[PDB]
Design an enzyme around this catalytic site. Structure first.
Site, PDB file in Angstrom:
ATOM      1  N   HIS A 241      -7.333   6.629  10.042  1.00  0.00           N
ATOM      2  CA  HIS A 241      -6.170   5.915   9.381  1.00  0.00           C
ATOM      3  C   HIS A 241      -6.947   5.092   7.993  1.00  0.00           C
ATOM      4  O   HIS A 241      -7.306   4.054   8.187  1.00  0.00           O
ATOM      5  CB  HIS A 241      -5.683   4.900  10.337  1.00  0.00           C
ATOM      6  CG  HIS A 241      -4.329   4.327   9.752  1.00  0.00           C
ATOM      7  ND1 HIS A 241      -3.533   3.491  10.529  1.00  0.00           N
ATOM      8  CD2 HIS A 241      -3.764   4.309   8.568  1.00  0.00           C
ATOM      9  CE1 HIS A 241      -2.644   3.152   9.585  1.00  0.00           C
ATOM     10  NE2 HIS A 241      -2.496   3.555   8.483  1.00  0.00           N
TER      11      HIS A 241
ATOM     12  N   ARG B 192       3.392   7.383  11.029  1.00  0.00           N
ATOM     13  CA  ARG B 192       2.785   7.146  12.220  1.00  0.00           C
ATOM     14  C   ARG B 192       2.750   8.259  12.951  1.00  0.00           C
ATOM     15  O   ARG B 192       3.754   9.217  13.124  1.00  0.00           O
ATOM     16  CB  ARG B 192       3.713   6.156  12.956  1.00  0.00           C
ATOM     17  CG  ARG B 192       3.776   4.655  12.136  1.00  0.00           C
ATOM     18  CD  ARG B 192       2.383   4.124  12.417  1.00  0.00           C
ATOM     19  NE  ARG B 192       2.105   2.564  12.170  1.00  0.00           N
ATOM     20  CZ  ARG B 192       1.831   2.069  10.934  1.00  0.00           C
ATOM     21  NH1 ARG B 192       1.872   3.004   9.974  1.00  0.00           N
ATOM     22  NH2 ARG B 192       1.490   0.908  10.682  1.00  0.00           N
TER      23      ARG B 192
ATOM     24  N   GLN C 200      -4.851   4.546  18.428  1.00  0.00           N
ATOM     25  CA  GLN C 200      -5.731   3.964  17.380  1.00  0.00           C
ATOM     26  C   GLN C 200      -6.706   2.914  17.692  1.00  0.00           C
ATOM     27  O   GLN C 200      -6.416   2.191  18.170  1.00  0.00           O
ATOM     28  CB  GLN C 200      -4.858   3.916  16.051  1.00  0.00           C
ATOM     29  CG  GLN C 200      -4.784   4.984  15.072  1.00  0.00           C
ATOM     30  CD  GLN C 200      -4.118   4.842  14.037  1.00  0.00           C
ATOM     31  OE1 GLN C 200      -3.313   5.401  13.246  1.00  0.00           O
ATOM     32  NE2 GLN C 200      -4.325   3.659  13.462  1.00  0.00           N
TER      33      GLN C 200
ATOM     34  N   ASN D 122       0.991  -1.202  -0.023  1.00  0.00           N
ATOM     35  CA  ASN D 122       0.200  -0.019   0.057  1.00  0.00           C
ATOM     36  C   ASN D 122       0.820   1.278   0.130  1.00  0.00           C
ATOM     37  O   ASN D 122       0.298   2.307   0.510  1.00  0.00           O
ATOM     38  CB  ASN D 122      -0.973  -0.004   1.071  1.00  0.00           C
ATOM     39  CG  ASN D 122      -0.328  -0.090   2.447  1.00  0.00           C
ATOM     40  OD1 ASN D 122       0.888  -0.124   2.737  1.00  0.00           O
ATOM     41  ND2 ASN D 122      -1.060  -0.498   3.553  1.00  0.00           N
TER      42      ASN D 122
HETATM   43  N1  LIG Z   1      -0.869   5.348   6.492  1.00  0.00           N
HETATM   44  C1  LIG Z   1      -0.830   4.216   6.057  1.00  0.00           C
HETATM   45  O1  LIG Z   1      -1.940   3.582   5.928  1.00  0.00           O
HETATM   46  C2  LIG Z   1       0.292   3.537   5.820  1.00  0.00           C
HETATM   47  C3  LIG Z   1       0.525   2.724   4.944  1.00  0.00           C
HETATM   48  C4  LIG Z   1       1.874   2.157   4.752  1.00  0.00           C
HETATM   49  C5  LIG Z   1       3.070   2.520   5.500  1.00  0.00           C
HETATM   50  N2  LIG Z   1       2.790   3.104   6.628  1.00  0.00           N
HETATM   51  C6  LIG Z   1       3.929   3.718   7.531  1.00  0.00           C
HETATM   52  O2  LIG Z   1       4.987   4.114   6.483  1.00  0.00           O
HETATM   53  C7  LIG Z   1       6.217   3.709   6.974  1.00  0.00           C
HETATM   54  C8  LIG Z   1       7.116   3.688   5.609  1.00  0.00           C
HETATM   55  O3  LIG Z   1       6.874   2.706   4.913  1.00  0.00           O
HETATM   56  P1  LIG Z   1       7.684   2.157   3.470  1.00  0.00           P
HETATM   57  O4  LIG Z   1       6.928   1.509   2.788  1.00  0.00           O
HETATM   58  O5  LIG Z   1       8.381   3.386   2.950  1.00  0.00           O
HETATM   59  O6  LIG Z   1       9.016   1.595   4.239  1.00  0.00           O
HETATM   60  P2  LIG Z   1      10.536   1.386   3.900  1.00  0.00           P
HETATM   61  O7  LIG Z   1      11.030   0.645   4.805  1.00  0.00           O
HETATM   62  O8  LIG Z   1      10.707   0.975   2.402  1.00  0.00           O
HETATM   63  O9  LIG Z   1      10.927   2.872   4.311  1.00  0.00           O
HETATM   64  C9  LIG Z   1      11.377   3.610   5.536  1.00  0.00           C
HETATM   65  C10 LIG Z   1      12.721   4.398   5.388  1.00  0.00           C
HETATM   66  O10 LIG Z   1      13.113   4.946   6.418  1.00  0.00           O
HETATM   67  C11 LIG Z   1      14.466   4.738   6.680  1.00  0.00           C
HETATM   68  N3  LIG Z   1      14.666   5.170   8.045  1.00  0.00           N
HETATM   69  C12 LIG Z   1      14.357   4.370   9.109  1.00  0.00           C
HETATM   70  N4  LIG Z   1      14.797   4.865  10.278  1.00  0.00           N
HETATM   71  C13 LIG Z   1      15.585   5.861   9.937  1.00  0.00           C
HETATM   72  C14 LIG Z   1      16.249   6.975  10.946  1.00  0.00           C
HETATM   73  N5  LIG Z   1      16.127   6.828  11.959  1.00  0.00           N
HETATM   74  N6  LIG Z   1      16.884   7.881  10.085  1.00  0.00           N
HETATM   75  C15 LIG Z   1      16.679   7.946   8.800  1.00  0.00           C
HETATM   76  N7  LIG Z   1      16.210   7.067   7.837  1.00  0.00           N
HETATM   77  C16 LIG Z   1      15.609   6.150   8.569  1.00  0.00           C
HETATM   78  C17 LIG Z   1      14.828   3.479   6.134  1.00  0.00           C
HETATM   79  O11 LIG Z   1      16.284   3.624   5.928  1.00  0.00           O
HETATM   80  C18 LIG Z   1      14.193   3.226   4.941  1.00  0.00           C
HETATM   81  O12 LIG Z   1      14.595   3.687   3.877  1.00  0.00           O
HETATM   82  C19 LIG Z   1       5.994   2.257   7.418  1.00  0.00           C
HETATM   83  O13 LIG Z   1       6.915   1.882   8.485  1.00  0.00           O
HETATM   84  C20 LIG Z   1       4.599   2.655   8.167  1.00  0.00           C
HETATM   85  O14 LIG Z   1       4.974   2.907   9.449  1.00  0.00           O
HETATM   86  C21 LIG Z   1       1.518   3.951   6.948  1.00  0.00           C
END
Ligand SMILES: NC(=O)c1ccc[n+]([C@@H]2O[C@H](COP(=O)([O-])OP(=O)(O)OC[C@H]3O[C@@H](n4cnc5c(N)ncnc54)[C@H](O)[C@@H]3O)[C@@H](O)[C@H]2O)c1
Ligand SMILES: NC(=O)c1ccc[n+]([C@@H]2O[C@H](COP(=O)([O-])OP(=O)(O)OC[C@H]3O[C@@H](n4cnc5c(N)ncnc54)[C@H](O)[C@@H]3O)[C@@H](O)[C@H]2O)c1
Lengths: 361, 361
Positions: free
Chosen positions: B315, B267, B296, B128
């Site tokens: 959400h 988040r 939530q 997603n």
């Molecule tokens: N609103 C929604 O319905 C929904 C849906 C999808 C995901 N999300 C949230 O979005 C987040 C991101 O999803 P994604 O698919 O891009 O994941 P992903 O793992 O591909 O991307 C996360 C990125 O964050 C970076 N990262 C983590 N900790 C870090 C830090 N301290 N400093 C710098 N960079 C850091 C990682 O290196 C990575 O590239 C998920 O973990 C989730 O919490 C929400």
């Protein structure tokens, strides 16, 4: 307190401007597009010995517009608060020579009537075509992803994901069609490039480049009904002409896919009021959204305000603070050129030498 | 009415699912992501002689979640209605071996605690990430162009263009920064390509390709504070880790340009509640919007509901009907693989072999 001007024979010209009131918001001088700041051109007109009169009072025959109209050489209108220049109003306008639209779309002028009187009608072509393209993507995503009920829900204290996502979809691998492949049509397709659409389609009298179509990732649809019946989303991007008034009627809306979305930041009257309301109530339309209405202001009881799944606002998209800057500059320029007996850019002409621009035919 | 299963020794496994209720909206079988339709996997589990128990009742210690948790082998959660799996809840979970998130983001699980118990935690990576990228553009345009007050205004019968456009701008020639260059970060930049941004910036521990950066029209910012102070718009695109909890505090928000926009569909807890409220009230933030909350459901009195210039929803973005299809399929697949003693795709593992995925460190 000065009787003359820098014009022929020192004839003082009167410039009449109709703008909405910004009241306290006029404290921001970037807020040019309002009756209080009047595009920031007052000193530049007054210093030439010209008269500048402005009002937000344009409605009914008792209006400041109708009083001041008689001896005005130059009329500035704005689509967001448009002076409706009927055959009658033009005929009373004894000195009127130039009609300049502070924005884009001069349909609030009787162009056939202006043409018959040999009057000049112009607009700031190109000045807010990116602003509307952005807002059209806004309206597509808001309707497809069902943002508005969710924003309403949490603002009133509720929490029900289902009551929103039962009618929320993704745009990816859907088909978008723009009715019009003009400046806004093209700026839309440029901005929908990255959304992984099934197809990007446009309908226009004019083919773009084969080279342009590749650039925009789009394909031309010859027949409108053929385009509509492939489309998850339909965007209106024509002027309001005689061809395009009520183009989105009962018949034409039923030709759209069941639960398809209709976005209109062009002009309200391109879509029949009752036809859009009903197809929103039946769900034949997934939703309808736009900033433009067939009456401006929209009456309190305009059904598009209260119908289900709507993304309606007042007429805002082409009059963001950033858009106001561009059409203010373009309006000042055309008044400058008019006083200098200089031609405007060819594209800014809606009515010149008793003829309408080809896109209003 | 059948005592055995197709598993080792015919041990009947219990699969526990926590989903929001869709009530009448469950009549749409595409509405997989709800307690009533339970991802459409009940017959496929029951027919293996496995037990499938689902509930929307996850809150307080009297909950169906806490009753059923004791003898459950497999827990399915969903971020939209997340079972908060505390150290205590995990320790009561005597049979629990697999935690699978029907969505993306497994921060509603105590990962350090799951890791200590040698439990397996997985999520439908990628399922997603396009849906949220679309919704992030939605939220950017809605806040920059001031859609929501305008939609509210006309829905309640008003008409005042100024009361909207006094705080409405264009995105063109502005600078957007994504905190995170992961799947959503990248899908955002892909979708902002056509908007004629000044710069597209990202901050991540990981450089993308030089080749990838060209593809995305983006540039890396080494220092977060350096990125923030160039940005008209900031988008949060990290998981909620120990590094990223309260990352958007008083200090970090004041480092953003005056009147800059903050979008968070990652988040809620990545942004301090009171810090976001206050900077919205002062105008240091032009606005804040997102679908995600630090609790939530969000309590009735969550200030983010009632603060000025907000584009908040429940959400929703990662649980459109189109997203539900993808994470349903991915959840069924991982349960399939688990029963077959087959490894999941390496990217789906949050906790494996007592270790956290690098992006949660
Ligand atoms: N609103 C929604 O319905 C929904 C849906 C999808 C995901 N999300 C949230 O979005 C987040 C991101 O999803 P994604 O698919 O891009 O994941 P992903 O793992 O591909 O991307 C996360 C990125 O964050 C970076 N990262 C983590 N900790 C870090 C830090 N301290 N400093 C710098 N960079 C850091 C990682 O290196 C990575 O590239 C998920 O973990 C989730 O919490 C929400
Ligand atoms: N909401 C706002 O604030 C706002 C701002 C800008 C413009 N507008 C409206 O948008 C309209 C379009 O603006 P634009 O900059 O793209 O103008 P444009 O002249 O570049 O594009 C209009 C296109 O419509 C086509 N067309 C006209 N009549 C047609 C017909 N009958 N069949 C097929 N094609 C037809 C023309 O060939 C042209 O390509 C304006 O006329 C105005 O009414 C609204």
């Amino acid at each position: 307190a000065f009787s003359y001007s820098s014009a022929a024979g020192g004839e003082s010209k009167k410039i009449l401007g109709v703008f909405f009131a910004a009241h306290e918001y006029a404290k921001n001088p970037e807020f040019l597009g309002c009756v209080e700041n009047a595009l920031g051109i007052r000193e530049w007109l007054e210093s030439k010995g010209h008269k500048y009169v402005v009002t937000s009072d344009k409605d009914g025959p008792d209006s400041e517009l109708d009083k001041e109209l008689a001896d005005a050489h130059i009329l500035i209108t704005t689509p967001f608060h448009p002076a409706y220049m009927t055959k009658e109003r033009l005929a009373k306008a004894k000195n009127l020579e130039l009609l300049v639209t502070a924005g884009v779309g001069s349909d609030h002028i009787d162009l056939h009537a202006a043409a018959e009187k040999g009057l000049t009608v112009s607009e700031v072509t190109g000045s807010n075509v990116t602003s509307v393209a952005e807002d059209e993507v806004l309206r597509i995503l808001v309707l497809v992803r069902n943002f508005a009920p969710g924003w309403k829900q949490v603002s009133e204290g509720g929490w029900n994901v289902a009551a929103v996502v039962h009618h929320a979809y993704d745009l990816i691998d859907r088909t978008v069609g723009t009715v019009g492949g003009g400046r806004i049509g093209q700026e839309l397709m440029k901005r929908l490039k990255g959304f992984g659409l099934k197809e990007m389609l446009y309908y226009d009298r004019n083919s773009l480049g084969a080279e342009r179509e590749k650039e925009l990732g789009c394909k031309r649809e010859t027949d409108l009904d053929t385009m509509l019946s492939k489309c998850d989303v339909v965007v209106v991007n024509t002027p309001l002409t005689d061809q395009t008034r009520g183009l989105f009627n009962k018949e034409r809306i039923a030709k759209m896919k069941k639960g398809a979305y209709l976005v209109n930041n062009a002009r309200g009257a391109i879509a029949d009021t009752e036809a859009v309301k009903e197809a929103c109530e039946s769900g034949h339309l997934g939703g309808y959204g736009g900033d433009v209405w067939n009456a401006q202001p929209a009456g309190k009881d305009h059904p598009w305000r209260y119908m289900p799944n709507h993304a309606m606002t007042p007429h805002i998209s082409g009059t963001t603070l950033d858009a106001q800057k561009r059409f203010a500059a373009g309006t000042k320029d055309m008044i400058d050129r008019w006083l200098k007996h200089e031609a405007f850019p060819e594209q800014n002409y809606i009515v010149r030498e008793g003829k309408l621009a080809s896109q209003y035919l």
